[PDB]
Amino acid sequence: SIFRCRQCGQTISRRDWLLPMGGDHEHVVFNPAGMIFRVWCFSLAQGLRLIGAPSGEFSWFKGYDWTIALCGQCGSHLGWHYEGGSQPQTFFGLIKDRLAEGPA
Ligand SMILES: COc1cc(N)ccc1C(=O)N[C@H]1CCC(=O)NC1=O
Ligand SMILES: [Zn+2]
Numbered sequence: 001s002i003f004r005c006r007q008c009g010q011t012i013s014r015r016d017w018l019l020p021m022g023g024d025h026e027h028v029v030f031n032p033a034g035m036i037f038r039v040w041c042f043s044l045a046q047g048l049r050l051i052g053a054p055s056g057e058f059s060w061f062k063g064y065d066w067t068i069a070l071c072g073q074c075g076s077h078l079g080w081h082y083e084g085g086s087q088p089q090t091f092f093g094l095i096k097d098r099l100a101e102g103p104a
Pocket of ligand 2: 005006007008009010071072073074075076
């Protein structure tokens with residue numbers, strides 16, 4: 001039911017907050033460095049630190065700009081916050097294998 005940071009246990013999100021963007025909460029993507037991510041979209045998340053200002057470059061999600069989202073506790077890269085778009089205006093794309101799932 002709750003997702004925590006796999007490295008340190010910081011409280012991050014909830015299964016209840018999964019968001020099906022374009023029909024699926026799961027999206028498999030690669031960046032310009034060829035890294036493949038299995039990204040789960042969430043309407044809401046907490047315990048992150050968003051670093052820098054948003055960028056639209058190479059955005060996986062049409063009409064959204066991204067900011068890097070670290071674990072606010074341990075600084076591990078957990079995904080991205082997306083903003084600037086429509087319906088919803090914002091959401092989080094978190095890297096599923098960087099989270100741990102477990103009880104409330
Ligand atoms: C400018 O993107 C990068 C450049 C690099 N040299 C290395 C990595 C990234 C990177 O992971 N970009 C991601 C951000 C999220 C997004 O939606 N799409 C991406 O492609
Ligand atoms: Zn952490």
